[PDB]
Structures are given as structure tokens and as C-alpha cells.
Design a protein around this ligand. Structure first.
Ligand SMILES: [Zn+2]
Length: 147
């Protein structure tokens, strides 16, 4: 194939490490219920979280669609499930800081960024990059505190 291929393995290990985990069928309403679908494909994911303050204490995710979308979300949610609000706001600031600074997450936990960096930038995956990442952003992220 005349492509970089640099994404396949990334999300392969992503969908594979997550296979060890529960799948892409979980939803709750103890806090916030985030839903995002890409009508262009069939891509849809639901990040339902449980944040009793400024911490994500639980997060259940439902996903169906492209192999990368349902993979990146469920992997990074599994990682996000163990974060705080400030940290995840930083994950969104980091997503913004990456493309300009060349560095990214000082913790190197990039479950979504790794999988979606290749997604975010294809005309065929960009609507899915809004699907997955922006939903993840709409879950506990914002990039900027408000400035
Ligand atoms: Zn798609």
C-alpha cells in the first residue's frame, strides 16, 4: 500500500490492549453523559462519566463505527477513567500544544492522541477525529481554562 502505515500498529495495540478490558458497551448517568456520532459513517461513541467534583471516578463508554474510533476512545477512556478534570483539561491543552510545541503529554499517556493523530488529519477520518477526540474533549476537556 502507498501509505505511511504508521497508525495501524498504534491502534492495533490500542484495540488489542483494550480487548483485555471490557468492550465498547457501557453507559451511566451519575454525572455527565457524552454522545457523539458521525452520520457520515455510522461512527458513534458515548462517554458516560462519573465525576463527583473535579475527578473522574468512573467512566463507561459505548462505541461503534470505524476500527480506530471505537479503539481510541475505549483505550483513552480506560486511561482517562483514572485522571482528574484538571489533568484532562491539560490533555486537551496538550493536544493543542503538541502540534505547535512538538512535545505533548509530559506523562506520555496518549491512548487517544496516538491513535487519533493519524485520524484527525485525513478528510476521511477528520469527522471521526471530531467524533472520537472532540467527544473525549466534551467529556472532561476544554484545552483552555477560559483564556
Ligand atoms: Zn468514520
Amino acid at each position: 500500500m502507498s501509505f505511511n502505515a504508521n497508525l495501524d500498529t498504534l491502534y492495533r495495540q490500542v484495540i488489542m490492549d483494550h480487548y483485555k478490558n471490557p468492550r465498547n458497551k457501557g453507559v451511566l448517568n451519575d454525572s455527565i453523559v457524552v454522545d457523539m456520532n458521525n452520520p457520515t459513517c455510522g461512527d458513534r461513541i458515548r462517554l458516560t462519566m462519573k465525576l463527583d467534583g473535579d475527578i473522574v471516578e468512573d467512566a463507561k463508554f459505548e462505541g461503534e463505527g470505524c476500527s480506530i474510533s471505537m479503539a481510541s476512545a475505549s483505550m483513552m477512556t480506560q486511561a482517562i477513567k483514572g485522571k482528574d478534570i484538571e489533568t484532562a483539561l491539560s490533555m486537551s491543552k496538550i493536544f493543542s500544544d503538541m502540534m505547535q510545541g512538538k512535545e505533548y503529554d509530559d506523562s506520555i499517556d496518549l491512548g487517544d492522541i496516538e491513535a487519533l493523530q493519524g485520524v484527525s488529519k485525513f478528510p476521511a477520518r477528520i469527522k471521526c477525529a471530531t467524533l472520537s477526540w472532540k467527544a473525549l474533549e466534551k467529556g472532561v476537556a476544554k484545552e483552555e481554562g477560559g483564556n
